[PDB]
Design an enzyme around this catalytic site. Sequence first.
Site, PDB file in Angstrom:
ATOM      1  N   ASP A  72       0.801  -1.213  -0.113  1.00  0.00           N
ATOM      2  CA  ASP A  72       0.016  -0.096   0.111  1.00  0.00           C
ATOM      3  C   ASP A  72       0.819   1.197   0.170  1.00  0.00           C
ATOM      4  O   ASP A  72       1.472   1.793   1.142  1.00  0.00           O
ATOM      5  CB  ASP A  72      -0.875  -0.002   1.044  1.00  0.00           C
ATOM      6  CG  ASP A  72      -1.948   1.041   1.150  1.00  0.00           C
ATOM      7  OD1 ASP A  72      -1.905   1.912   0.378  1.00  0.00           O
ATOM      8  OD2 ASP A  72      -2.771   1.056   2.175  1.00  0.00           O
ATOM      9  N   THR A  73       0.977   2.002  -1.017  1.00  0.00           N
ATOM     10  CA  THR A  73       1.563   3.321  -1.383  1.00  0.00           C
ATOM     11  C   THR A  73       0.790   4.494  -0.559  1.00  0.00           C
ATOM     12  O   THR A  73       1.550   5.248  -0.163  1.00  0.00           O
ATOM     13  CB  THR A  73       1.834   3.749  -2.816  1.00  0.00           C
ATOM     14  OG1 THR A  73       2.139   2.685  -3.370  1.00  0.00           O
ATOM     15  CG2 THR A  73       2.766   4.738  -2.558  1.00  0.00           C
ATOM     16  N   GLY A  74      -0.344   4.164  -0.285  1.00  0.00           N
ATOM     17  CA  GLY A  74      -1.230   5.312   0.550  1.00  0.00           C
ATOM     18  C   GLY A  74      -1.269   5.098   2.144  1.00  0.00           C
ATOM     19  O   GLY A  74      -1.889   5.962   2.514  1.00  0.00           O
TER      20      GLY A  74
HETATM   21  C1  LIG Z   1       3.213   7.571  11.446  1.00  0.00           C
HETATM   22  C2  LIG Z   1       1.966   8.384  11.698  1.00  0.00           C
HETATM   23  C3  LIG Z   1       0.954   7.313  12.288  1.00  0.00           C
HETATM   24  C4  LIG Z   1       0.106   7.908  13.018  1.00  0.00           C
HETATM   25  C5  LIG Z   1      -1.633   8.039  12.429  1.00  0.00           C
HETATM   26  N1  LIG Z   1      -1.247   8.119  10.875  1.00  0.00           N
HETATM   27  C6  LIG Z   1      -2.430   7.593   9.995  1.00  0.00           C
HETATM   28  O1  LIG Z   1      -3.352   7.117  10.493  1.00  0.00           O
HETATM   29  C7  LIG Z   1      -1.964   8.139   8.656  1.00  0.00           C
HETATM   30  C8  LIG Z   1      -2.299   9.260   8.024  1.00  0.00           C
HETATM   31  N2  LIG Z   1      -2.952   6.805   7.697  1.00  0.00           N
HETATM   32  C9  LIG Z   1      -2.750   6.403   6.593  1.00  0.00           C
HETATM   33  O2  LIG Z   1      -1.598   6.562   5.880  1.00  0.00           O
HETATM   34  C10 LIG Z   1      -3.906   5.639   6.258  1.00  0.00           C
HETATM   35  C11 LIG Z   1      -3.414   3.933   6.557  1.00  0.00           C
HETATM   36  C12 LIG Z   1      -3.121   3.907   8.027  1.00  0.00           C
HETATM   37  C13 LIG Z   1      -1.591   4.118   8.359  1.00  0.00           C
HETATM   38  O3  LIG Z   1      -0.892   4.277   7.551  1.00  0.00           O
HETATM   39  O4  LIG Z   1      -1.410   4.222   9.659  1.00  0.00           O
HETATM   40  N3  LIG Z   1      -3.851   5.350   4.853  1.00  0.00           N
HETATM   41  C14 LIG Z   1      -5.247   5.025   4.296  1.00  0.00           C
HETATM   42  O5  LIG Z   1      -5.991   4.604   4.950  1.00  0.00           O
HETATM   43  C15 LIG Z   1      -5.428   5.118   2.629  1.00  0.00           C
HETATM   44  C16 LIG Z   1      -5.992   6.548   2.585  1.00  0.00           C
HETATM   45  C17 LIG Z   1      -5.607   7.629   3.517  1.00  0.00           C
HETATM   46  C18 LIG Z   1      -4.296   8.375   3.042  1.00  0.00           C
HETATM   47  C19 LIG Z   1      -3.957   9.170   3.941  1.00  0.00           C
HETATM   48  C20 LIG Z   1      -4.702   9.741   4.614  1.00  0.00           C
HETATM   49  C21 LIG Z   1      -5.905   9.364   5.024  1.00  0.00           C
HETATM   50  C22 LIG Z   1      -6.457   8.016   4.083  1.00  0.00           C
HETATM   51  N4  LIG Z   1      -6.194   3.880   2.287  1.00  0.00           N
HETATM   52  C23 LIG Z   1      -5.614   2.748   2.607  1.00  0.00           C
HETATM   53  C24 LIG Z   1      -6.613   1.560   2.132  1.00  0.00           C
HETATM   54  C25 LIG Z   1      -6.060   0.190   2.182  1.00  0.00           C
HETATM   55  C26 LIG Z   1      -7.049  -1.002   2.114  1.00  0.00           C
HETATM   56  C27 LIG Z   1      -6.151  -2.105   2.370  1.00  0.00           C
HETATM   57  C28 LIG Z   1      -7.733  -0.821   3.331  1.00  0.00           C
HETATM   58  N5  LIG Z   1      -7.437   1.980   0.908  1.00  0.00           N
HETATM   59  C29 LIG Z   1      -8.914   2.336   1.083  1.00  0.00           C
HETATM   60  O6  LIG Z   1      -9.160   2.750   1.924  1.00  0.00           O
HETATM   61  C30 LIG Z   1      -9.524   2.638  -0.273  1.00  0.00           C
HETATM   62  N6  LIG Z   1     -10.494   1.535  -0.311  1.00  0.00           N
HETATM   63  C31 LIG Z   1     -10.611   0.779  -0.969  1.00  0.00           C
HETATM   64  O7  LIG Z   1     -10.095   0.519  -1.837  1.00  0.00           O
HETATM   65  C32 LIG Z   1     -11.823  -0.431  -0.687  1.00  0.00           C
HETATM   66  N7  LIG Z   1     -12.414  -0.816  -2.150  1.00  0.00           N
HETATM   67  C33 LIG Z   1     -11.221  -1.788   0.045  1.00  0.00           C
HETATM   68  C34 LIG Z   1     -12.081  -2.399   0.758  1.00  0.00           C
HETATM   69  C35 LIG Z   1     -13.003  -1.836   1.866  1.00  0.00           C
HETATM   70  N8  LIG Z   1     -14.112  -2.400   2.170  1.00  0.00           N
HETATM   71  C36 LIG Z   1     -14.304  -3.653   2.904  1.00  0.00           C
HETATM   72  N9  LIG Z   1     -13.015  -4.380   3.270  1.00  0.00           N
HETATM   73  N10 LIG Z   1     -15.593  -4.053   3.206  1.00  0.00           N
HETATM   74  C37 LIG Z   1     -10.278   3.867  -0.438  1.00  0.00           C
HETATM   75  C38 LIG Z   1      -9.199   5.039  -0.567  1.00  0.00           C
HETATM   76  C39 LIG Z   1     -11.086   3.925  -1.691  1.00  0.00           C
HETATM   77  C40 LIG Z   1      -2.398   9.261  12.974  1.00  0.00           C
HETATM   78  N11 LIG Z   1      -2.971   9.168  14.105  1.00  0.00           N
HETATM   79  O8  LIG Z   1      -2.025  10.427  12.474  1.00  0.00           O
END
Ligand SMILES: CCCC[C@H](NC(=O)[C@H](C)NC(=O)[C@H](CCC(=O)O)NC(=O)[C@H](Cc1ccccc1)NC[C@H](CC(C)C)NC(=O)[C@@H](NC(=O)[C@@H](N)CCCNC(N)=[NH2+])C(C)C)C(N)=O
Lengths: 99, 99
Positions: free
Chosen positions: A25-27
Amino acid sequence: PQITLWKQPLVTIKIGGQLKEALLDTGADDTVIEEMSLPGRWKPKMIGGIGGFIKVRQYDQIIIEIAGHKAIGTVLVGPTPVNIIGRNLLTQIGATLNF
Amino acid sequence: PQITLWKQPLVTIKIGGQLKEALLDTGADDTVIEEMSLPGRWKPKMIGGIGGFIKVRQYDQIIIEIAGHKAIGTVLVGPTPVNIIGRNLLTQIGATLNF
Ligand SMILES: CCCC[C@H](NC(=O)[C@H](C)NC(=O)[C@H](CCC(=O)O)NC(=O)[C@H](Cc1ccccc1)NC[C@H](CC(C)C)NC(=O)[C@@H](NC(=O)[C@@H](N)CCCNC(N)=[NH2+])C(C)C)C(N)=O
């Protein structure tokens, strides 16, 4: 290797000695796995994405093999719908998407 | 245009006539843009992510420009915290993961 995206980028990983399938996951900034038993002390954290925020347990300095590529870093374990290898670990194995 | 994953893989895209920045997300099966007035007949949809589902409108055959690359596809518009280019569009620009 070079992975196209017509299909989800799933690969196999080995953590805590067991196999598991995860999505490149690049996102995502971090790596999160569905709830399992991992050796080591952990620290509660909150992370969010679409839908919102979920509680997870942060494990530091975890040795992980992703498609036969070793990385050792932070893994978060909690109720993610899919296991995802974020940039924190993708950077370790030299993953680039390109131009 | 491919998802240069390391630091957040953000790039410029053009949709509906406006210049925008979006995150290239392998792991996003879909593309979801910030709330905007696109003309065109839609369909109400609900997409899921990390902590739950979000209601969005689905637009089909939308022309978008990802880092100077032209692509046409289904774009979803809703209360997303960031613009996300998903695999449905990434494949048309030939983006690949490389390690
Ligand atoms: C180092 C800091 C960590 C602290 C913490 N940081 C975060 O939470 C950071 C910003 N979050 C992220 O980077 C999160 C993932 C969690 C993580 O990395 O920790 N990223 C994500 O969740 C990114 C989108 C995003 C990016 C940036 C900001 C907001 C949202 N999506 C990741 C995700 C992967 C999938 C396997 C679940 N994809 C999706 O959510 C996409 N969804 C889909 O493609 C659906 N079709 C998948 C099936 C869902 N349904 C189901 N299972 N019944 C959507 C974008 C159309 C915080 N509290 O700030």
